[PDB]
């Protein structure tokens, strides 16, 4: 989150084009979709993470 | 078919028992279906299509969310069913959401 | 005929397509039960009524048995 926001803030700050501010927003999203387990390849990793989330809610019982 | 003898097959489908065993359940089935046979709500197969779409988006099963459009297309392509709205409303009513895994098309 | 073998083809396809729809929505209704539900839908049926029947019949074979 902080790292992707850094690039976004820098690139909107320096730029002189609003076509290149639609290039600061967009790369900020593209960082979030790749680092965090949200894209189609990372579904298998997320499938493992769901079991851990289940183990957490089990302790609540 | 006639509706009355067709109500017998469903009660032998849900129950594991025969119709000559219990007659209370079959009585209740014929009682409710014969008293509300025509729908109390209007047809919209369109919004029922969009609420199966909203469900497959809710599962993050969005590859099957565009596969449903083609199966719903095949249902209209043959067109052997008078009310395509009702059976989709039915499968929609008994829906179950784990909010987890994907599924294959199995071809 | 040949076009009379082309109609049964057109029913055998949909009864499988609705089966695919039955598994992707993850309902308990299996293929044998669905073939009856389609037949009820052909004359027209209140799906709120048909669903209520199924929801009562399941609670008299898991509640007594």
Curated annotation (Swiss-Prot), chain B:
Tissue distribution: Ubiquitously expressed.
Residues annotated with Phosphoserine modification: 107
Superkingdom in the source lineage: Eukaryota
Coiled-coil ranges (or none): none
Subcellular location: Cytoplasm, Cytoskeleton, Microtubule organizing center, Centrosome
Family: Belongs to the TUBGCP family.
Subunit structure: Component of the gamma-tubulin ring complex (gTuRC) consisting of TUBGCP2, TUBGCP3, TUBGCP4, TUBGCP5 and TUBGCP6 and gamma-tubulin TUBG1 or TUBG2. TUBGCP2, TUBGCP3, TUBGCP4, TUBGCP5 and TUBGCP6 assemble in a 5:5:2:1:1 stoichiometry; each is associated with a gamma-tubulin, thereby arranging 14 gamma-tubulins in a helical manner. Gamma-tubulin at the first position is blocked by TUBGCP3 at the last position, allowing 13 protafilaments to grow into a microtubule.
Function of the protein: Component of the gamma-tubulin ring complex (gTuRC) which mediates microtubule nucleation. The gTuRC regulates the minus-end nucleation of alpha-beta tubulin heterodimers that grow into microtubule protafilaments, a critical step in centrosome duplication and spindle formation.
Record-given protein name: Gamma-tubulin complex component 3
Origin species: Homo sapiens (Human)
Source species taxonomy: Eukaryota, Metazoa, Chordata, Craniata, Vertebrata
Full-sequence portion shown in this chain: 7 to 113 of 907
Swiss-Prot record, chain C:
Primary role: Required for the recruitment and the assembly of the gamma-tubulin ring complex (gTuRC) at the centrosome. The gTuRC regulates the minus-end nucleation of alpha-beta tubulin heterodimers that grow into microtubule protafilaments, a critical step in centrosome duplication and spindle formation.
Main location: cytoplasm
One Gene Ontology term from the biological process aspect of the record: gamma-tubulin complex localization
Subunit structure: Associates with the gamma-tubulin ring complex (gTuRC) consisting of TUBGCP2, TUBGCP3, TUBGCP4, TUBGCP5 and TUBGCP6 and gamma-tubulin TUBG1 or TUBG2; within the complex, interacts with TUBGCP3 and TUBGCP6 to form a luminal bridge with actin that stabilizes the initial structure during complex assembly. Interacts with TUBG1.
Keywords, alphabetical: Acetylation, Cytoplasm, Cytoskeleton
Keyword Cytoplasm: yes
Localization, UniProt: Cytoplasm, Cytoskeleton, Microtubule organizing center, Centrosome; Cytoplasm, Cytoskeleton, Spindle
Domain of life per record: Eukaryota
Transmembrane segment boundaries: none
Coiled coil: none
GO cellular component terms attached to this protein's record: centrosome; cytosol; gamma-tubulin ring complex; interphase microtubule organizing center; spindle
The protein's name: Mitotic-spindle organizing protein 1
Membership in a protein family: Belongs to the MOZART1 family.
């Amino acid at each position: 989150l902080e790292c992707s926001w850094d690039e976004l803030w820098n690139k909107v700050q320096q730029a002189q084009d609003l076509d290149h501010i639609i290039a600061a927003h967009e790369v900020f999203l593209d960082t979030i979709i790749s680092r965090c387990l949200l894209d189609s390849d990372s579904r298998a990793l997320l499938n493992q993470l769901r079991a851990v989330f289940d183990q957490i809610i089990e302790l609540q019982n | 078919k006639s509706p009355n003898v067709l109500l017998q097959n469903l009660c032998c489908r849900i129950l594991g028992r025969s119709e000559a065993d219990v007659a209370q359940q079959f009585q209740y089935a014929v009682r409710v279906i014969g008293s509300n046979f025509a729908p109390t709500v209007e047809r919209d197969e369109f919004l029922v299509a969009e609420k199966i779409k909203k469900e497959l988006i809710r599962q993050r099963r969005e590859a099957d969310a565009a596969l449903f459009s083609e199966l719903h297309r095949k249902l209209h392509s043959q067109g052997v069913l008078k009310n395509k709205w009702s059976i989709l409303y039915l499968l929609l009513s008994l829906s179950e959401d784990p909010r987890r895994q994907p599924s294959k098309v199995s071809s | 005929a040949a076009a009379a073998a082309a109609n049964l083809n057109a029913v055998r396809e949909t009864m499988d397509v609705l089966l695919e729809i039955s598994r992707i929505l993850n309902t308990g209704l299996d293929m044998e039960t669905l073939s009856i539900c389609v037949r009820l839908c052909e004359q027209g049926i209140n799906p709120e009524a048909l669903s209520s029947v199924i929801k009562e019949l399941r609670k008299a074979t898991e509640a007594l048995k």
